[PDB]
Design a protein around this nucleic acid. Sequence first.
RNA 1: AGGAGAGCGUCUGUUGUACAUCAACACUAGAUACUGCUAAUACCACUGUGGAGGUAUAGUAUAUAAUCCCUGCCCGGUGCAGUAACAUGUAAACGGCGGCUGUUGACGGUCCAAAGGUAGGAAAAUCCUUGUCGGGUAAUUAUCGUCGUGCGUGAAAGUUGGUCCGACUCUUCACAUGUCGUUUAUCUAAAACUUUUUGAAAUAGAAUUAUCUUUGAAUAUGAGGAUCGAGAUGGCCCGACGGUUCCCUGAGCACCUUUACAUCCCUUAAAUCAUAA
RNA 2: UCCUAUUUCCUAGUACCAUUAGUGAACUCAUUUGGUCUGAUCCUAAGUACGCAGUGAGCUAAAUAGAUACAAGGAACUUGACAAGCAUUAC
RNA 3: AAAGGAAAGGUUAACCGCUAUUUAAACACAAAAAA
RNA 4: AGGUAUGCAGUAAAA
RNA 5: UGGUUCGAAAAAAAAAUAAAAAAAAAGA
RNA 6: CCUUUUAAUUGAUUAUGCUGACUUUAGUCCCGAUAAACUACAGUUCUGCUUAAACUGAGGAGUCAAGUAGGUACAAACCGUACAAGGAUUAAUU
RNA 7: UGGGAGCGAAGAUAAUCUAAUAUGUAGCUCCGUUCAUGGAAAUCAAAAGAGCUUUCACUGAUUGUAUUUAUGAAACGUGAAAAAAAAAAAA
RNA 8: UAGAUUUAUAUAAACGGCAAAAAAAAAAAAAAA
RNA 9: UGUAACGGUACAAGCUGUAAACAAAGG
Lengths: 264, 444, 35, 23, 80, 349, 68, 69
Amino acid sequence: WTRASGMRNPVKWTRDWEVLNRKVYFAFDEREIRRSMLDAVSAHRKTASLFHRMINAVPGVAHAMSLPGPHTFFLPSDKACRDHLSPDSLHALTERVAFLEEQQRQRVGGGTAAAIADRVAKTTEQLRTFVLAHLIPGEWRMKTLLLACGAGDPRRNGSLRYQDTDRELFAPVMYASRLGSVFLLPPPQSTDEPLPVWVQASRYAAFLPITTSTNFPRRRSTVGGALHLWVGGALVTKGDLRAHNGVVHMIDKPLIPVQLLASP
Amino acid sequence: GILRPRERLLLNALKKEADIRYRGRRMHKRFRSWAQQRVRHYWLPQKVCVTSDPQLMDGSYIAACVQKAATLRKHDLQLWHGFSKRILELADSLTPQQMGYIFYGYGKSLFRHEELYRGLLPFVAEALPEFHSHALMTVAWALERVRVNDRAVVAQIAEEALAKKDLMRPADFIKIVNCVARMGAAPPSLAAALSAELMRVLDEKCNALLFRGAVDHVAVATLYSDPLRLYLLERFTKTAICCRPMHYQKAFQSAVAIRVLHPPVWQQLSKAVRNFYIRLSLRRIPQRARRPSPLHWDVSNALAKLGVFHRNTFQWGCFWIDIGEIDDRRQCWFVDGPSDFYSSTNEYTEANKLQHRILSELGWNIRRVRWNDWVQLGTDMDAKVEYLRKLRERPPWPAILTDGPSSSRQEMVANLRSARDVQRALKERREKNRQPHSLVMNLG
Amino acid sequence: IRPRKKGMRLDRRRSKKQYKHGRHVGGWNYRWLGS
Amino acid sequence: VRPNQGRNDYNQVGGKKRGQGVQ
Amino acid sequence: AKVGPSKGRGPLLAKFAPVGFKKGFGAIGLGRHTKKGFFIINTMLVPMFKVPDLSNCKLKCYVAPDTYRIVQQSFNKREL
Amino acid sequence: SSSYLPRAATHRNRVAFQLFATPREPTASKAAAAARAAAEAVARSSTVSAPFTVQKQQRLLALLAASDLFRVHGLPGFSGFRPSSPPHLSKLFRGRVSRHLSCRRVNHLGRNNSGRITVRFRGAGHFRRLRFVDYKRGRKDIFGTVLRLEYDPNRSAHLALLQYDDGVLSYILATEVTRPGDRVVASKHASIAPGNCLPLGNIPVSTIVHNVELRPGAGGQIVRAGGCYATVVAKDRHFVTLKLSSTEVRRFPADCWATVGQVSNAAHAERIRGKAGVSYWMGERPRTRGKAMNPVDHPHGGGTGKKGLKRPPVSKWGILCKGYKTRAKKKPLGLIVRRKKANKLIKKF
Amino acid sequence: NKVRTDKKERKRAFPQRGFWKKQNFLQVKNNTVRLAFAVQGVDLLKLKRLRWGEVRKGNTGWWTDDYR
Amino acid sequence: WKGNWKGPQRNKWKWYHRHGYWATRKKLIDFTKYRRYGYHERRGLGKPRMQFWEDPSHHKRLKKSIRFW
RNA sequence: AGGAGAGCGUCUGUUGUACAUCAACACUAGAUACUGCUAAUACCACUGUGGAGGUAUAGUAUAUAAUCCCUGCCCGGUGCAGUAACAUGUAAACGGCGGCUGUUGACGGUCCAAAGGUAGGAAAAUCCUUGUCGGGUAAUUAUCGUCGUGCGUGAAAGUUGGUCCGACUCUUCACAUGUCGUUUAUCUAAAACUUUUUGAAAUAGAAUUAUCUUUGAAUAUGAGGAUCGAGAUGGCCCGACGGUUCCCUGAGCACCUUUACAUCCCUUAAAUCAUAA
RNA sequence: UCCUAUUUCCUAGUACCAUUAGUGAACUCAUUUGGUCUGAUCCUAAGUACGCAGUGAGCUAAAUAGAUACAAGGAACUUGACAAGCAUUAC
RNA sequence: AAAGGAAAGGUUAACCGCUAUUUAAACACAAAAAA
RNA sequence: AGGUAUGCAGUAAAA
RNA sequence: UGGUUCGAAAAAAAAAUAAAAAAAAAGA
RNA sequence: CCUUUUAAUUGAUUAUGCUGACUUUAGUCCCGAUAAACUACAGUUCUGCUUAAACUGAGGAGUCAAGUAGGUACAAACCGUACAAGGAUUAAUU
RNA sequence: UGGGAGCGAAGAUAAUCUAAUAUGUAGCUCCGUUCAUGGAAAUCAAAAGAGCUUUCACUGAUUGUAUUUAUGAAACGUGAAAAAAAAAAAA
RNA sequence: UAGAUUUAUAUAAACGGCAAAAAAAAAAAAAAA
RNA sequence: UGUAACGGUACAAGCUGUAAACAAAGG
């Protein structure tokens, strides 16, 4: 009998480092998630309000996003939509989402009435196209995307591995002697153009040697980390929101399809 | 029961990762104590409802309500302005205990309503003979925290504490002396009397936990006498073990101020004490996060547009510098906001003057920006650039920081409102400039 | 005695059996203090 | 596993323990 | 026996028991356990020692040997 | 077992209601009007009225049979282990049972409140969860969609996750022809289609049913195992006669509800285990023969070398176990019309 | 144990040829003690080796007697 | 024996919960038998009679029956 | 623990801790029987619990077991089912499956019976001093194959087989070989002898306790006769029926069986109120 | 005036009880040197930049337990290839 | 496939609960009712 | 995949 | 760093122990 | 003394008797795995096995037992020894 | 508590065995012992009589029950001990 | 009987339904002590 | 009532309760 716990855990774990490495694999790559992609979207509804509303108000979209097939959903934020969409486009999107919600609420509760069906059909098709433009076949996790873009390849990761800065300009008291590859993802479900993905070095990478032991040989976004993953011209802000049937990646720009874009 | 082998492996790995997560989580909790203290011997035994109609409140009820709201962080503007109105109506009928609790609530909540303090102070002065230690301490403490300066009344409170020395609590006396020093209200005779009494209070009545509160660099520099300075600096070496980063920081600042402005006292110290403070100068004293204010950021933006390299909000020695230029490191700037002066006046605080003098004597060429003048520029950038250039083209400021012109509460309120409007406009037109707004959808 | 039986047994002093015997240091016919 | 599983009081409904907030 | 108070072991103590055994020695309580493993202390419950000003006190632990003679004579003068 | 909800909640001989109503309207009169409207809508939608027979089941099954990107990229799984089919192609869900509709199973391990073994040959087995399946189909006149089919470790049949039109989730027994996307309803006006639940008095003769209530509103109790089904033989005003999977003909009150179709997973009996370990996982323990023991341990035990039974077969407790009837003679037959005979006689006659 | 409740006396009823002396461990411990004393200017080993009534100041001995 | 040898265990939790003071109280045994380290009902004589030369002002006989404030 | 084979169990498993690791038990599967749900069965406070929060593709009971081909005849007996009772059914229900004679006898006679043991193994874990013939050997009470000669066995209380398996019982070939004719050399020791340290045990009626030959409660250190110089130490076990943990019997005990007897519990058969209609 | 917000937040001295933080079955047990040796793991090791541990003295008898090496023969042994033997040998 | 965690706590949401409630500690700081 | 630092009640969701 | 404490969850009570002494007028 | 009586449960070479003491076997069996030196002018014996770092922002990756098993004079004594803020900021004093 | 109440065995005798004896005993639970148990006749007896209840001796190991073993302070009665009936319609 | 007199010995029974925790909503719920 | 645990006392099979062997002379 004992009540020791925490740092005095009486469980005799193995110390074998190879077994612990296998445990790492099982605990991270092969971990099981109960929730679904829409569960994650709802959890982040306050930051992704517009897309949450569209998913819940456009018929068929929820059914498509709740299917077993492993999927990857690139979720834009309301901030991203506001920043990148023109004011008129944002107003139109808000008005149409509100219209669908209002028709749904009417269901809960001449030619003018006939036109309502046509408008509903048009709005549903357009918003379904928009929302499904972010759904991609397969489960593409963040590290897989980075390794596909080439980060981690010793032959290609140059310009991302040895970033340095003019140190004396930022940590002068320590430098008195100085004081003197585009990967392609399958097309969205509603389009045929495959999605380009690339990687870049963040502004924070250059400062690593100032505060870390290094073994080197002979505007800018504020998102954290050393590497930035760009998908279709949009930056991933929060990745690996894993689910049971896919993964959600948060992005800072909406991937509007060419059909919905205005040519002039 | 049994599990399928895949399930066994997955759950075992989850357990291992949970253990490692716990171990990693507890790594930085050096100063996490499972045993914790909570102060509750100031809570009154009577019950009150804070939202009750003020017209039914008396002094005893309103004071308790104010203190309870301050404790519970119920910072509602309507509620506290009703409190102010009712308290001003009841000014004639408050005891020193009730006035002390009211001042505690106002100061603790940092409710910067100058009119209430101004209207309550005359009754405090009149009733001073009946005041007790806690009430005197609380009045001084709240005034110091909110920057409501009344030197005559503060001096009267200190004199009352001296007269009631045999009844004053040591902590209350220490706080009163610190507040007097910070408000600059003691002429030399009162300063000498306070130092003489504080010496005996600390030597006879205060253990380490009470004494460490006496270590304040402003008081050491401007108020304490030489024997008191020597005693304080010697005693800190003995009482360091029980101190916290704030106490260490104030001790270090006191030592630097004595060294820079009182070399005779520094030399009158002993070699062991001097060694203690030299070794203290080598330690990493935990600071707390500081960031440029909106006014600081506006000044930095104007300076950068002018074309002067600079750095912001950094620590040199035992001081924090607002702006430190890079090309000529000795040139530095300070952006002075409403809280750097006393309410309704352009008179600098004692801490600000002490820091200015110490940095100037250590070599810094200081220049200063006043929000009262900056706000009159508006949102214009050319005007701000010209302002900063003209300031640069002029000599640095003397080692002694002189106060600005006279002002009034009316002008202070007007300038605060103008600063609010300018902040709003600048933030709006910053974020709008950031937003691209280039995607046009043919959805219609 | 194990938990299941302990959960159903009662303490010795919950009855009067303790006072119905005369066992003592001197024998089996204890004369109580105060007779 | 549960020594008191069969008792009349095992997993009894109600009680002051679980009815703290009930008026 | 091999466990218990026999062979001079006496009553059980946390020193001799496994971790989890709870047994103090008679100290007063000074606070409350929280719901998350903490303990909030209340200094109002600290006993207050009442000590008089011992400075300038002519009394001492013992009494001089002559006091017996002095008091005995002073009482005999009354009794006689 | 009784380790779940207490007796006060589980035991009720006479159920006073058969419709679990969840009205939305503010008043009782408007609730009644809405219920009538819903019943009329179900009646309007109902079109199929012919019996659902074995042959129609076969035709539907034949019709159903006639009618690389999707993976975790960069995820090299186990060296040898792999699921039999990916989630988007497996017949069953491949996921986890809903937590809100299930609880941990209390494993009694064949021991009663006395702690002694009463049910022999029981083992721990794999950990299991009890899931709350709606045997009542209490919600009437509301359509629901079958979203997925699920495995159940305590039950020989498959379960189906039903999402009612208002968002309520429940688990029901799945029929042999139940597929994701199916629409189901419980009502007296419902069409005769598999999965629908109707009173036995509204189901035409020759129809195949399952999950039959012994008492109205008390939840189906008869015909539950995978592949089992019962046939409607005759109907009168108050009683309906059913032929059961055991070849027993029994009458049921016309107000007892039932579901149309055969119980899913008719291939359960075709499973081959291959080794003792599969039964060990399933929760079995070795069965020692009576004649392998000593005479003190079984009536068949004893005797140098191997021997025969030396008497007509009896159990551990001295009861004939080959042809000896055990139903209480005085217990009335009640609604039982005719009870089956021995399988040898059935197959020889 | 010190209370003599164990059964360790049972083996001591039989002869053994010898016993390990643990001299490596004991000498490490002794030299640790000697270093602790010596850093303060004490010759513990010399004190332990002194004859009864013998006085030797500093690091002196028979060799000092010989050469003086 | 088979493999590693296992004998009677020394378990403080088990011993104290099964054979301690309260467990012995709950047992059904002869409680008139003297137990050195446990409950028993072999009652003692109490404080003996005072010798004729002792001080009655200091002789004591009762503790609980006369317990005042 | 290799190559080539046989027997028993299919197999991986369980297994008597401390004389039995096996051919014994279990096992995947094929069957039979009971059970309509407050199910049967089990526990035996019984309006309770496990069964099972399961519902005849389920649960319980009893055999036989995994793969292939097969699984003959008998309901006379016993049990069970069936019916008011019969009739009748049920053997993968418990069980059983001939004798004396004529023509080596296809084919007859006669008695008996419910049926008269079928197919297939077969000198066998059954029979037995080493059955006939063949391979291996110089020599084959062994082993394999074969005959069906002798004794016989025998069909889900299962018959005959294919492959693989076993700390199982056996046959054979090969290998370097101290297993052997038959032993020797060197070295070490939880081996022995001396010494230092230090110290038991089983046993003991008493002993100053010889060999031959005899006698004797019948195989004597002690009794008759004859003969004979003895103590310790090292070794060896001829004797001292050497010392200490198998067989019969009692007006003794314990456990097991049931067409031994008696009693009790249960299930039937009933009875009795609740109980009025 | 192009950072996704330019958002005040260090450690209130701290109830009671446990701990010898290392080698090591360190437990039950007792012919109990606590600690060496007898097995995996735990430090990118020329065994981890000198670590942990090391118990009276003698002495050619045989017998025994082992280790090594056996000429030529090669199972002739034995109930039985039990036990042994091979699985090293120019480089 | 043999079909596997959800009590208390933290996070987010919601919230007309309460000194059973963050020092009578401190730092920082263009900052805020009504009119 | 027990509970982490103003603390008692209290609903939902979930790497 | 653990126990304690909330949960698991337990009168399934470790004799000489406690957030555990008659339980708010507490005199701030 | 003698006399009379005594219910003393009154006589022991023996119950593989009971509780003990003391002989014989006998000065016999029993002695666990590797050991040396510490010096008449410098030093580094040999062997078995290898987690022996003890701050580098991290309580140094556990549980359990010793009812205190590595403190201390060639001690089976006396005395002493588990500090969660690690107290020596003792770069002091001299 | 060999007193009183409830439930209630076997070893032993019967030379096995059954009844009966052991025994209404042991264990278990409950009263708590003269300030108690009990009790002032719808009693017992003979055609005469006794006079609540209780203890002792005799009648007597009788008449009985058990029918191989044993059990049996029987009833009436006789000689003694103790002696009691009932304060009390209110005030 | 001058004062003082720690802790354990699970006690609202100086008392009344039984029944866990010296006494627990009705019912389920069961008894030779 | 009885007993015990710790503590004090000659570190105790005695005595004793933090007032732990003694107050007897108080407006």
